[PDB]
C-alpha cells in the first residue's frame, strides 16, 4: 500500500489537478476508474490513547470498510480533518455509509455530491471542504450532512458557489410556482408558520395555505413547515433578490 501516492491522488482532486495520469495512479491503488467518486470530510475517531495516529487508524478503517462493501477509498488529511474519497453510488440510509461513519469522531461529517468519475471529483472535494468550513454555523446539523444542505452557512461565509446554488437549486424552481405560491410562502414565513393566523391574513382556509405549502415542496423539495427548510427558503429568497 503506497500511502504517499494515495494522498497525492486525493490532493490532486482537492487541487483540481485531474489529468488522465491521475486515473492510472488510482488504478495502481485498486480504484475502479469508471466508478462514481464522492468526497466526504470529517474528524478521525479518537483512539484508545497514540493521538497523532488517530488519522492513520481512521484511514485504515475507512479503506477496510470500503473493501468489505466492495468499494474503494482514498484518504488524506486536511489539518485535523480526514478527507476520504469513496467509490460507487452512495445512499444516505445505506450500510456502507453507516459503517464508514464509525471511522470518524462524534463530530460533523460533511458529504460532497457524487461525481461521475474520480477525475470529475474536484467539485465534490471543494464543496465538502467548504461545507466543513461552514458547518460550525449550524450546530444542529445532522451527522452526516450534505454540502448542498449547508447553503445558508456557506453563503454567509462568502462561498460564491453556495450563492449560485441558492439561485439555481432553490430560487429558480421556486420561481416556477408563480405569484400566488410565492406570496403565500412569503406571508407564511413572516407569520412564523402560524397557519390559522396567516390564513385569515391571506383570506383563505387554513387547508388552502397547507396545500399551497405542499406545492412549494412540490416545486422545490423544501417543506416550508420544517424549520430548516423554511430557513433555507427564506435565505434563498433573499439572495434571489440581491443578485
Ligand atoms: Na461515490
Residue numbers in the entry: 165 to 213, 216 to 409
From the article:
MabR (Rv2242), a PucR-type transcription factor, plays a crucial role in regulating mycolic acid biosynthesis in Mycobacterium tuberculosis. Regulation of the fas-II operon is mediated by Rv2242, the gene product located immediately upstream of the operon promoter. The MabR structure integrates three distinct structural modules: a non-heme globin, a GGDEF-like domain, and an HTH motif.
The crystallographic asymmetric unit contains a single protein molecule. These two domains are connected by two helices, α12 and α13. The GGDEF-like domain of MabR adopts the canonical fold of a diguanylate cyclase GGDEF domain, which comprises five anti-parallel β-strands (β1-β5) surrounded by five α-helices. The buried surface area of this interface is 1128 Å2, which constitutes only ∼10 % of the total protein surface area of each monomer– a relatively low percentage compared to other observed dimers. C-MabR displayed a clear binding profile, forming a 1:2 DNA-to-protein complex with an apparent Kd of 4.3 μM, consistent with the TSA findings.
